Amino acid sequence: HRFLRH
């Protein structure tokens, strides 16, 4: 769906 973020 979408990219990862942290």
Side-chain angles (χ1 to χ4, degrees):
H1 306 280
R2 211 120 171 161
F3 228 35
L4 320 86
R5 206 264 145 190
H6 63 185

